[PDB]
Amino acid sequence: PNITNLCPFDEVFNATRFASVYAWNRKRISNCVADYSVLYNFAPFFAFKCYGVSPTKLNDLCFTNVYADSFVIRGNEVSQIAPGQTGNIADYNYKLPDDFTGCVIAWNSNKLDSKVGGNYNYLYRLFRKSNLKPFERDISTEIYQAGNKPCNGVAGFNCYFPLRSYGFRPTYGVGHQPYRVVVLSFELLHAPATVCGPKKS
């Protein structure tokens, strides 16, 4: 069988613009042949931690749907993109379930996401009433009511705007430089699995 119809991993990893972690981008991947060769080849990756499947045997075990979630966080927060973790990103921006089957990929993005004046186009949620459920997004801009008095839509004392900017600058320390994260989540359903890697003969 000849090899064609590769899965669009160039669109997710090599996008010119990623998304904020509060409005994290989700792309479904189905009915194509996914080769993980290109990802392994790429050297800059800071984390390639995989959960539930081995990175070496990605090409043979095959799945029904592959979800690629792309966002940008700061380097110190990459450890929070894991099952069972807590923090601002885990509780309020992006939560993975405790039975997560997939991989997390992160790499430094100073040359693309850092500006000398400060890149104010990457945002994160700092305040939220309750923790996020797994694979949930919150794009609400409602004023966080931390006290007893009603906020009435106006910030001030005990009333904070929940979305705070990741003011990325190139002179930050390595733990604070912008990191692009792609989370690959693999799922199997009762449907026939149609995301399967390449074949050899």
Partner: protein
């Protein structure tokens, strides 16, 4: 509940603060390494925005009541944020105080004493009068420079200090302090768990206790310096009297380190200068900082960041931009650590590189703390942890290990004695001056010294504590303390005394940690990871804990101890006792010629 509200308030504050503080620090860095009008005004607006935000948050933080906050880290953060400082006064009084401070700064920076009968030979302090105090041996020229700067600064700064004391007293009493001295002593206040409680009023007696036993070593050093200066000045110094104020090698007598050519023990033995060895081996500033980094990774502390090498200036740029010559370690925030130092290839700049990288390591270690707790444990800890690196870097073992000093180098007792004497002139000699100056300022702010009897008190205590006599009688129209930089520009001075004590306490604790079996001044902490971990336990704390706890984490004691300082200077103390048998140790308060 109030505590959860405080937690969310601090979460909002740290995020906004870190960003504005980084912008202010980056603008200050861009001015300091590139001096122009636009960088100056950019620094002005960045600092204005950061200060306005800090006062706006401090006014909101004062609304929280600390009686219902249980977690001590949030309570310490809110205590740090609730310090209003000079904003406690009204706008008119604050503007008047700022006017007095600015006019004091611009009259100290433009201080001028000019030659009598030679009106063209007018000398400033920074380029030329300090050269006269440091190098000149003529008695009349030093008497001229000292009395002239005392007159043309004290006469002009006496009424400015008169209302400066009153405005600072009003500012301190607006912040629930007894006086401005208690406000400065509030930097050493530690509220924490049982046994770690430190009070402001305790600090004075602790300082006095630590001055009760530095006094014999200082008396022997003073007797030796007096005899050598009597050899230099035949009839102008008395054997039983105090030293004249203008013969101490500095403008104010703060450091006795410029008396080392006059007071050298063994002139035939050279010093431990390795500048020519650096010249012969082709060292540059990059290699100096790399050797300092090698020392800090040998002791166990982390490596320097890539941003440190990329963003710092370690050389005069010489591409048309003016820079500030003073070495400064910068913690800009967000993991940005820089050093601004115009490093020439000398031994002094090598030790200074070790000192500033010690500052940077101290800054890097407490980066894990929240923003309000990213400081030193007190004002003395930050400079003590750089002075210990300067101490360990200068030892002959460290210099022989890195190839600067030959492997067959012999350490006889004479070079140890003259090295210890130079260290004593720098370190021991500044302690009575620091203690007497801070005691005078505390008693002036308290009102223990009457307003019209200032000068007569000061020259008594310099005759009593420092053992230094005035050359000419001064009446109360002079303001002789105010000629010093730290007091005319509103700076606390007890940090140097506490720095000096903490430096040798830290050094003895690290040398016991490294299992060194010799004299303390020969000790090197290189290749000792356990000493680095013992140090890094305190460095990681910041001011999250009381400073007594951090001090116990390093030395195992909860207060200042000068037994390490006397243990450091023990061979020199024995030598000074051995050469003061015939002479008279001590001074007489009455004016002896």
């Amino acid at each position: 509940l109030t505590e959860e509200n405080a937690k969310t308030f601090l979460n909002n504050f740290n995020q906004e603060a870190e960003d504005l503080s980084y912008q202010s620090s980056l603008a200050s860095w861009n001015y300091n390494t590139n001096i122009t009008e636009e960088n100056a005004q950019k620094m002005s607006e960045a600092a204005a925005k950061w200060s306005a935000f800090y006062e706006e948050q401090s006014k909101t933080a004062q609304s929280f009541s600390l009686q219902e906050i249980q977690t001590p880290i949030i309570k310490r953060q809110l205590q740090a944020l609730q310090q209003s400082g000079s904003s406690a006064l009204s706008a008119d009084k604050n503007k008047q105080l700022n006017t007095i401070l600015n006019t004091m700064s611009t009259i100290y920076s433009t201080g001028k004493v000019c030659n009598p009968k030679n009106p063209q030979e007018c000398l400033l302090l920074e380029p030329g009068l300090d050269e006269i105090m440091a190098t000149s041996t003529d008695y009349n020229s030093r008497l001229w420079a000292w009395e002239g700067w005392r007159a043309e600064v004290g006469k002009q700064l006496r009424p400015l200090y008169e209302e400066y004391v009153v405005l600072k007293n009003e500012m301190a009493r607006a912040n629930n302090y007894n006086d401005y001295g208690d406000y400065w002593r509030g930097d050493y206040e530690a509220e924490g768990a049982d046994g770690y409680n430190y009070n402001r009023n305790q600090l004075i007696e602790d300082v006095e206790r630590t001055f009760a036993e530095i006094k014999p070593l200082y008396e022997h050093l003073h007797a030796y310096v007096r005899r050598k200066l009597m050899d230099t000045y035949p009839s102008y110094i008395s054997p039983t009297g105090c030293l004249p104020a203008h013969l101490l090698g500095d403008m104010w007598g703060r450091f006795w380190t410029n008396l080392y050519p006059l007071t050298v023990p063994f002139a035939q033995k050279p010093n431990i200068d390795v500048t020519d060895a650096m010249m012969n081996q082709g060292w540059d500033a990059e290699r100096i900082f790399q050797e300092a980094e090698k020392f800090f990774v040998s002791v166990g502390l982390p490596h320097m960041t890539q941003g440190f090498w990329a963003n710092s200036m370690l050389t005069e740029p010489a591409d048309g931009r003016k820079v500030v010559c003073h070495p400064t370690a910068w913690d800009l925030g967000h993991g940005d650590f820089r050093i601004k130092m115009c490093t020439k290839v000398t031994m002094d700049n090598f030790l200074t590189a070790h000192h500033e990288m010690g500052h940077i390591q101290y800054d890097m270690a407490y980066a894990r703390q929240p923003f309000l707790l990213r400081n030193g444990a007190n004002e003395g800890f930050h400079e003590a942890v750089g002075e210990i690196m300067s101490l360990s870097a200068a030892t002959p073992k460290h210099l022989k290990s890195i190839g600067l000093l030959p492997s067959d180098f012999q350490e006889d007792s004479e070079t140890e004695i003259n090295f210890l004497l130079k260290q004593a002139l720098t370190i021991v000699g500044t302690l009575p001056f620091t203690y007497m100056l801070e005691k005078w300022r505390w008693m002036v702010f308290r009102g223990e010294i009457p307003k019209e009897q200032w000068m007569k008190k000061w020259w008594e205590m310099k005759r009593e504590i420092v053992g230094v006599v005035e050359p000419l009688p001064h009446d109360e129209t002079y303001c002789d303390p105010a000629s010093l930089f730290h007091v005319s520009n509103d700076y606390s001075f007890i940090r140097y005394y506490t720095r000096t004590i903490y430096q040798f306490q830290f050094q003895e604790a690290l040398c016991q940690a490294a299992k060194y079996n010799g004299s303390l001044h020969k000790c090197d902490i290189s290749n000792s990871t356990e000493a680095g971990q013992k140090l890094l336990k305190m460095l990681s704390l910041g001011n999250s804990e009381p400073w007594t706890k951090a001090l116990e984490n390093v030395v195992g004691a909860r207060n200042m101890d000068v037994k390490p300082l006397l243990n450091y200077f023990q061979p020199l103390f024995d030598w000074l006792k051995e050469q003061n048998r015939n002479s008279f140790v001590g001074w007489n308060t009455e004016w002896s010629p």
